[PDB]
């Protein structure tokens, strides 16, 4: 009689279809998903330092818009900018806005140090009804609106040496009045001109008198500029009118900081990978949640599923 001895392998009733080089659909005993396609819907507040902008864009927090005083000197790994954010101060623009936003985002700090600029012969601390604090007229906290003193505005020729071991970021501006009579009422001379320089750079800006559409009842504008001052260099501001002066400098750091646009709520939880949709698990190598990411994240791909076989071909009975 003898015996029979058969060699064989397992199978499962419920196999999984995968793709191969020679076949787009072959059933294997088991597989695992390589594309993360879901989020929790919230941004976990750990382990990255999250700063929710709430009503404030980064730039409004920088300049010191009245809704943003709580942000002074704060740091972040990720600044979260909300779609509802709006400005509630003097109407302004920033030539190169995207670059200023980027460089502050990447620096990751609003640390500010006041400095004693000698604004000899002018009136300081100008304010406006377009920028209220507690119903008083106010202005951007980090800027100083200079105007005539007893109908004179003597030329400004002011120096600030950088004797620190770090770089300084100065934010300053030019006021563009609505009319010639407004120019004279504020600065006591028919035009201004502003030249801000260091040993290695210079910027001059000309005010441009004219009407723009009223925003918070203001038809004038302020245009914002910036200057970085290296250790051993010197900031020189020279102007005859229309200067929106710096009150000091911001620290500029380097590191892992960034900014993200999202309306996702912040939650008390821990997740390494952040997207605008919310935090996502980072076990898988790929994800199709969002091209925009921060942290240790799977790589964005177009596919919504990629199944890696983790077993043999399934050959059911």
């Amino acid at each position: 009689p003898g015996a029979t001895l058969c060699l064989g392998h397992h199978a499962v009733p419920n196999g999984t279809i995968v793709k191969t080089i020679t076949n787009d659909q072959i059933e294997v005993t088991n597989a695992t998903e390589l594309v993360q396609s879901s989020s929790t819907g919230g941004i976990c507040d750990s382990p990255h330092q999250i700063l929710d902008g709430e009503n404030c864009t980064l730039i409004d927090a920088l300049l010191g818009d009245p809704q943003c005083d709580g942000f002074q000197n704060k740091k972040w790994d990720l600044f979260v900018e909300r779609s509802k954010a709006y400005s509630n101060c003097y109407p302004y623009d920033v030539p190169d806005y995207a670059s200023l936003r980027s460089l502050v985002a990447s620096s990751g700090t609003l640390e500010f140090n006041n400095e004693s600029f000698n604004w000899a012969g002018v009136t300081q601390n100008g304010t406006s009804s377009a920028c209220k604090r507690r119903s008083n007229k106010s202005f951007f906290s980090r800027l100083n609106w200079l105007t005539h003193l007893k109908y004179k505005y003597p030329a400004l020729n002011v120096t600030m040496p950088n004797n620190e071991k770090f770089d300084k970021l100065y934010i300053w501006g030019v006021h563009h009045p609505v009319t010639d009579s407004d120019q004279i009422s504020l600065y006591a001379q028919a035009s201004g001109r502003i030249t801000v320089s260091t040993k290695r750079s210079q910027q001059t800006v000309i005010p441009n008198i004219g009407f723009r559409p009223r925003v918070r009842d203001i038809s004038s504008r302020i245009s914002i500029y910036w200057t970085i001052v290296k250790p051993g260099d010197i900031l020189l501001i020279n102007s005859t009118g229309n200067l929106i002066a710096p009150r000091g400098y911001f620290k500029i750091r380097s590191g892992k900081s960034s900014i993200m646009r999202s309306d996702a709520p912040i939650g008390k939880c821990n997740s390494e990978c952040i997207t605008p949709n919310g935090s996502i698990p980072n076990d898988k190598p790929f994800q199709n949640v969002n091209r925009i990411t921060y942290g240790a994240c799977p790589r964005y791909v177009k596919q919504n599923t990629l199944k890696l076989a983790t077993g043999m071909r399934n050959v059911p009975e």
Partner: protein, 173 residues
């Protein structure tokens, strides 16, 4: 499939084998049985776990990058930002597609390989005492009780013990 055992000369798998991936079924004069083969099972699992160790829990940290959505029309610079990102995503999407196709082809082949290797190791062990029926089964030409079957499964089967009996049965008329 490239070796031809799984989905090939082995007609189908065994849904009732739940303690291993490969193994043995027998019939002899004491009954029938099934037993997993640990070596081959672990060889396949170890290789697949090797793939998983390279792919799972291995992400890249990135921080400040470029903007990827835009509220205003700008022209040249934005065209370039968008094209860089689209380029990157298409290259990564290609890498992911090829990775899974290649890896899956190879997983199917390596698991087939492990089945084939177990078959070959058993074939050689049986020497002149059995014949390959062509479907992964050997006809054993001698009495082979439960201990005898276990000696084959555990690599202690001594073909010389049974050879006279087997040759007589094989080359009968």
């Amino acid at each position: 499939g490239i070796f031809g055992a799984i989905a090939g000369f082995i007609e189908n798998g065994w849904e009732g084998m739940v303690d291993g991936w490969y193994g043995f079924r027998h019939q002899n004069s004491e009954g029938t049985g099934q037993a997993a083969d640990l070596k081959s099972t672990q060889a396949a699992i170890n290789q697949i776990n090797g793939k998983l160790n390279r792919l799972i829990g291995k992400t890249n940290e990135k921080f400040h990058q470029i903007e990827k959505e835009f509220s205003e029309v700008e022209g040249r610079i934005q065209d370039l930002e968008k094209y860089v990102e689209d380029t990157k995503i298409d290259l990564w999407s290609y890498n992911a597609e090829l990775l899974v196709a290649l890896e899956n082809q190879h997983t199917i082949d390596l698991t087939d390989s492990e089945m084939n290797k177990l078959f070959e190791r058993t074939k050689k062990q049986l020497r002149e005492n059995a014949e390959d029926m062509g479907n992964g089964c050997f006809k054993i030409y001698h009495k082979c009780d439960n201990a005898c079957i276990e000696s084959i499964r555990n690599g202690t089967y001594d073909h010389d013990v049974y050879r006279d009996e087997a040759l007589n049965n094989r080359f009968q008329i």
